[PDB]
């Protein structure tokens, strides 16, 4: 016969929305995908597709702390399949963190209450989607860099909730920018910086 097995199995995911893209583009062949947790009863999900991508979210979100393993079986199109395994995936430690967003902000006395949007995630506890903060808890610090337009030298403030109460100078322009950091991690620890935004 002749039907090529797979290569380039990549886990791609932001906020737990996980998809497995791979190669090569099917040349007169269909792939079927099997996903299991860490070493176990495999569960087929993407039946004899021709796409080189499989959205396995429903699976990974059942337990973001587990390390999933997967494989792609190559079946011959038209009138013992070959398979290649995916790398391990541990949702809680490798999903990229989507770019943050300052949700709003209004002065609370001699200070400026700043706030980050509590993003929603595919993670579903009970019949509910938990937020980013619902999933990570205190294991999610937001780093705010702010600085006054006037100068080039910045300032920083940390928070492990969603708002900051930063004092600022009376009648001055201050731009802001904030980054998400999961401290627990050893690799995808940070997100991209949220679009800078300024005051008056």
């Amino acid at each position, epitope marked *: 016969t002749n039907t090529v097995a797979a290569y380039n199995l990549t886990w791609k995911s932001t906020n737990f929305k996980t998809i497995l893209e791979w190669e090569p583009k099917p040349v007169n062949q269909v792939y079927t995908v099997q996903i299991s947790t860490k070493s176990g009863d495999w569960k087929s999900k993407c039946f004899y597709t021709t796409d080189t991508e499989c959205d396995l979210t429903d699976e990974i979100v059942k337990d973001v702390k587990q390390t999933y393993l997967a494989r792609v079986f190559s079946y011959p199109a038209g009138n013992e399949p070959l398979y290649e395994n995916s790398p391990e995936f541990t949702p809680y430690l490798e999903t990229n963190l989507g770019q943050p967003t300052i949700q709003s902000f209004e002065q609370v006395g001699t200070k400026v209450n700043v706030t980050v949007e509590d993003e929603r995630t595919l993670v579903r506890r009970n019949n509910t989607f938990l937020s980013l903060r619902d999933v990570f808890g205190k294991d999610l*610090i937001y780093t705010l860099y702010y600085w006054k337009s006037s100068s080039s*030298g910045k*300032k*920083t403030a940390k*928070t492990n909730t969603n708002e900051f109460l930063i004092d600022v100078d009376k009648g001055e322009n201050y731009c802001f920018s904030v980054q998400a950091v999961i401290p627990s991690r050893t690799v995808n620890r940070k997100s*991209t910086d949220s679009p800078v935004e300024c005051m008056g």
Partner: antibody
Amino acid sequence: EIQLQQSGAELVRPGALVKLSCKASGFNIKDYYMHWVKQRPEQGLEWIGLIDPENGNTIYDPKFQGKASITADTSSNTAYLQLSSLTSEDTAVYYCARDNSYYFDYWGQGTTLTVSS
Amino acid sequence: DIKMTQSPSSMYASLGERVTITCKASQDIRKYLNWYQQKPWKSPKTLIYYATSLADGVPSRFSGSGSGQDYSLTISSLESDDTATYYCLQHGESPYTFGGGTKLEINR
């Protein structure tokens, strides 16, 4: 596994400028915030400044602005700290640390800068 | 800008004794207080972080309490390798400030 390396010793002539370095090993500095902490003889620790190797941002204690400048080469996984307009008052030991957000969880051994002729 | 005030500068105590070093910040730091131990000729070690969490293999006799402006590290049963210098470092917002530190000398 993880580790930060520093020059150990360094004698410098007053007025000159110097660039201590701190090489990172077993972690990527673009995932953390590198710090620099000075410490003079009969005195306690003093924060110099930080740097976010990621989106090249740096923060400085007021007291050092102009006197210092933390730089990082994300290729060679190295953070820097260049002092300037040197006076005897710069003679101290420089540590570079690693901030995981909750605390400085790795310290390079110290560099012992001596400004003299 | 945001000052830390650690007390006492030095303090002699005997083994098995309990000791309390203290740090007061001039404004709610929101438990972004860390206690550091420095043995002579040694990079500092991180004893307690986030006001009350024990860290990287710290002995259970170390503990810290705090909220807002009041923070304190306490060693229950003082021992030999506690002769060191302790610093509190607030790292809630720039600039990051270490307190003045205190030197525990063991009485024996």
